[PDB]
């Protein structure tokens with residue numbers, strides 16, 4: 001039944017999530033929840049974090065775990081100045097700034113809407129960064145699947161099914 005399923009996915013997440021200090025905060029934020037809404041939010045957040053870490057590694061970027069805005073990222077490299085943007089990942093090499101946006105969407109309509117949003121968001125930054133002699137390389141890692149390197153696919157499936165079941169409530 002529903003209660004046994006939730007306990008079981010919590011156990012699976014607990015056992016089989018890749019031991020990674022970078023997931024422990026969000027892992028716990030998921031495990032402590034009782035209410036269906038919170039279990040969605042935090043479970044979906046946990047999956048998104050797994051994808052962000054993967055996407056940064058794949059693309060040679062630093063994961064933005066401290067939620068730094070672009071403006072702050074530059075201030076930290078002594079560069080002086082923007083639209084508020086908190087990238088999923090980044091790399092600054094001299095005057096070349098790589099920004100990474102990644103996401104997951106299941107339906108093509110949603111995927112496109114989110115792709116357009118992330119694209120325009122980064123394009124708007126490009127013109128403003130020019131004024132401080134920063135070249136922007138914008139990268140969008142748009143995914144249709146939640147599968148990732150932080151959790152076995154079979155665990156992933158059980159988690160999303162249980163989460164879909166919580167949409168009942």
Ligand SMILES: [Mn+3]
Pocket residue numbers: 048052088102103
């Ligand atoms: Mn993200």
Ligand SMILES: [Mn+3]
Pocket residue numbers: 091092093
């Ligand atoms: Mn750096």
Ligand SMILES: [Mn+3]
Pocket residue numbers: 087088101102103
């Ligand atoms: Mn993003």
